[PDB]
Structure 1
């Protein structure tokens, strides 16, 4: 029952700026084994681990994933499982696939063949997330085709693990209506990344065009809350109509946003996700959107309370 699997997934946190960088540590985070103690003790049910497999596999057939990297991913997954955390792994920042899905289709499918083969006998609390935030030339209609091809590859190997399927147009709500999950697939969860209002959550983000114009933006008015509720109602209606569970696999506000607004937004979205029985994972543990200080070994207490 994928709804039961969604319940098991529960509340989680992304350990980002880590394995989805070109190399682990490049973006500031190395996944320390003790992080899993910290996260489990704080009350989280799962971790989401973004992984840039594409830079750690050969470019030519059979597109073999490199040994040392595979071993590292094993180590991370098992570290989390040791603490009784559920684990979401994905394919993250496969930029060539977004820019030319035709050229990279078979390589992408080869990655999933290898990942499914590697983890098919791992515990049922490991989840396979097909592809992070499809966008660009990987259009909604092309994604519907590609995700089905990936489902077929994974299911040819593994009919035990729940699969997590995102939306196109950068993984938010805008392309949810366009998403199609094949009827034959019966053990999947649909994932959405929720960052609205984008101008608030990404204000001052150095990698986002024109974001400096958003610096100082607050969040918390009654109207702000009603707008967010309307969007959550839209997602919930889609879930009910399509009979698929919902995982909000990323949500969070950047550190440049005022702390009081960050707390209000984070706490509110979590309460509203909970009312809808969704699973959820905060972006992210300890970096630019972070809630834990790895030097001081302390949580931001208000943000941790918001997440529970």
Structure 2
């Protein structure tokens, strides 16, 4: 089945309800202690998530999720330079997981994620561009026959890791590198075989940041209507993403102001300019505050739905402890842990509320 619809991204995006990330899974990176030679697909579970199965996705699809992002870290599974051959058992497992939502008719986003080699520094950009082309040549070849519901996202949050400008929008060095890398990704996939000339491709601004500086220095192609801007927006910060000092457990007036500001940024940079965009990651972590988060999620969803922009929940499988607690589905037991959040996504999207597989009330 190698058919692909010839459809613009803006038209295709209309078919998207809302999404879910298979977080802390194929993106988990454990090369400091795991032997990837003896465990070539072991990294999937090395951050504590269960082995992925189709029923995780069917549980979510029952709740009207129809976009599934598969964040994938290829670092550790890549052969030596300059061929950068991807381990074939790893590629097969990535392929099995893409197929869980894809063969059930949903949208799938496959990316490159926690890579050590695509950092946004001019020092290494010549080498990083070669590795990016080699990696995407192989991904594009493996999935060349897939239709329009399989989307490639060329980079995740390329940035100047470990610098003062890592998380505040970047600087000119970082913007030029991210743009050059995005161009290599687009060219590599467009130049490849099969349906890839008509595949929908996502590219991020620097760090995928919802930021004035990142947005303003983001190059976007003017002659390719099947390219999509990839943005991440865990907004407002202290309520949604702050895992240290200053975190708040209520979505208050100042938090709404901050969220409204960033949504308006997306409107002015992308929506008003006819640039297709997807919020590929967002979420608010568990602070024993499900109703605060449900109200925030319904408001966020309603506002971006009025702009035609879909969003994709970041679910890293973590519910308690010191880590970031973005879990939404209990993958082991196939239960929605926060049913009022899922109800908020449905209601805010304009859908009928029907939360299936909810956990019992304790």
TM-score, normalised with respect to structure 2: 0.78
Verify the 8 A CA contact 1:148 1:181 in the aligned structure 2.
no
C-alpha displacement of 1:31: 1.6
1:69 matched to 2:90? yes
CA–CA distance in structure 2, aligned partners of residues 167 and 269 of structure 1: 21
Where does residue 290 of structure 1 map in the other structure? 327
With over 3 angstroms needed to count, the CA separation of the structure-2 counterparts of 1:59 and 1:254, relative to structure 1, is farther
- SS of equivalent to 1:14: strand
Verify the 8 A CA contact 2:208 2:231 in the aligned structure 1.
no
Instruction: Describe the superposition over 1:44-94 as per-residue Cα deviations: whole angstroms up to 9, x where unpaired.
Output: 111000001232111322111111011101111112112111100000011
Instruction: Describe the superposition over 1:262-302 as per-residue Cα deviations: whole angstroms up to 9, x where unpaired.
Output: 22222221111111111210011633301112344321211
Where does residue 227 of structure 1 map in the other structure? 258
CA–CA distance in structure 2, aligned partners of residues 11 and 223 of structure 1: 26
Verify the 8 A CA contact 2:72 2:112 in the aligned structure 1.
yes
With over 3 angstroms needed to count, the CA separation of the structure-2 counterparts of 1:297 and 1:74, relative to structure 1, is closer
Structure 2 matches for 1:193-212, cutoff 5 A? Answer: 193-204=232-243, 211=244
User: Aligned residues, how many?
Assistant: 300
With over 3 angstroms needed to count, the CA separation of the structure-2 counterparts of 1:131 and 1:190, relative to structure 1, is same
Instruction: Describe the superposition over 1:244-278 as per-residue Cα deviations: whole angstroms up to 9, x where unpaired.
Output: 11101001012246333322222221111111111
Mean Cα deviation higher: 275-284 or 230-239 = 230-239
- SS of equivalent to 1:227: helix
- SS of equivalent to 2:221: coil
Structure 2 matches for 1:55-94, cutoff 5 A? Answer: 55-94=76-115
Verify the 8 A CA contact 2:249 2:287 in the aligned structure 1.
no
C-alpha displacement of 1:101: 3.2
Where does residue 208 of structure 1 map in the other structure? none
1:151 matched to 2:172? no
Find 2:65's aligned residue among 34, 44, 67: 44
1:8 matched to 2:15? yes
Superposed CA RMSD in Å reads: 1.9
Where does residue 173 of structure 1 map in the other structure? 211
TM-score, normalised with respect to structure 1: 0.91
- SS of equivalent to 1:124: coil
C-alpha displacement of 1:306: 1.7
With over 3 angstroms needed to count, the CA separation of the structure-2 counterparts of 1:214 and 1:129, relative to structure 1, is same
Find 2:176's aligned residue among 128, 141, 144: 141
1:214 matched to 2:246? yes
Where does residue 97 of structure 1 map in the other structure? 118
Structure 2 segments unaligned to the other structure (5+ residues): 1-7, 30-42, 162-172, 319-324, 347-362
With over 3 angstroms needed to count, the CA separation of the structure-2 counterparts of 1:232 and 1:44, relative to structure 1, is same
Verify the 8 A CA contact 1:285 1:292 in the aligned structure 2.
no
With over 3 angstroms needed to count, the CA separation of the structure-2 counterparts of 1:161 and 1:218, relative to structure 1, is same
Instruction: Describe the superposition over 1:83-132 as per-residue Cα deviations: whole angstroms up to 9, x where unpaired.
Output: 11110000001122216433322011110111111112112100000000
Find 2:47's aligned residue among 11, 19, 27: 27
Verify the 8 A CA contact 2:209 2:231 in the aligned structure 1.
yes
Verify the 8 A CA contact 2:17 2:66 in the aligned structure 1.
yes
Query: Which structure carries more helix by proportion?
Result: 1
Larger radius of gyration: 2
Verify the 8 A CA contact 2:297 2:345 in the aligned structure 1.
yes
CA–CA distance in structure 2, aligned partners of residues 119 and 18 of structure 1: 20
